[model samples]
Target: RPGGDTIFGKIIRKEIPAKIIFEDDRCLAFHDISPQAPTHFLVIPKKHISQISVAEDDDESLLGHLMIVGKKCAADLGLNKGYRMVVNEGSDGGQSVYHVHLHVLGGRQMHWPPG
Candidate 1:
């Protein structure tokens, strides 16, 4: 049950349907149900990493891969104006889901000091 425990895990397994935008052997991208911005989606690693705070040194490439994938996906989605990449560290940092995910938000003016 490496990934089947979290909602994201279920999404990865197709146990739950999601508006998927991108997928690869290492990661998956999909639109967020409750978006904070006009163009908001998430790129998540297939191998479950509970949170970035728990990421190990060996996970460097996987983490970097998420950013790369986010950039590519953003370009494909026409987020040429600019975009935001957010990774909530923990509960206090606004992370509602347990699985680590990189949020891509754009398509409008983004304010500073996001809560």
Candidate 2:
């Protein structure tokens, strides 16, 4: 998430309260309403950049921050054994939300290719 008024913005603005699992000046992480895994959650840049391809060169640190935060969140949630972080780039990538979000999934065996 890095610059628009999508659902991610609403979540950050508290307009649509979410079960926020992690937050900081750079990003936010929350539980997904329609989860794909028992421990499914999301991590996004609060700035709202739309999608990864459009990310700016200055967004490098922000992008890395999301990774660090997502991983820490999964470990904290007891997904110590294993977990997966998926980012859907566009429609073909299954990105229905249009906002850059990293899906943290675990708590069960996962598959390869991941759709």
Candidate 3:
């Protein structure tokens, strides 16, 4: 058999390989191959909803649940001190993947005012 369209959707369908850290009926969590942080992970929904802008008005519950899962998985991955969560929107928001997802970045002291 085949798989879904987006890379993440394919990951959810087990078409592509990923180091799955957390999984549930609603979504799946895994380590980022090109990690930006020490314990970077991607949390994607099992259901397809292209980007956050495309989310329906009734998608509140599911969206909120995504964050809950993110926090839980973040702690599981040892993001104890703190963590940063981001849900990129469309192309302008640096979303290379069409499917909506959240990025959990942590495990080290982050900085600001970069040149």
TM-score result, candidate 2: 0.94
Which residue runs of candidate 2 sit more than 4 Å off their true CA positions?
1-3
The prediction achieving the highest TM-score against the true structure is 1
Q: What TM-score number comes out for model 1?
A: 0.96
lDDT of 3 by residue, 5-53 (tens): 8888778888789999888888888888998888888888888888898
Tens-digit lDDT track for model 1 on 24-59?
999999999999899999999999999999999999
Ranking by TM-score: 1, 2, 3
Q: Look at candidate 2 and tell me the lDDT of residue 60.
A: 93
lDDT of 2: 0.89
| Local error of candidate 2 at residue 19 (angstroms) | 0.4
Each model's lDDT = 0.94, 0.89, 0.83
Cα error, residue 83 of model 1, in Å, equals 0.5
The residue-by-residue lDDT of candidate 2 on 73-112, one tens digit each, is: 9989999889999989887887888788999999998898
Q: What are the clash counts of all predictions, listed in order?
A: 0, 7, 0
Winner of 2 and 3 under TM-score? 2
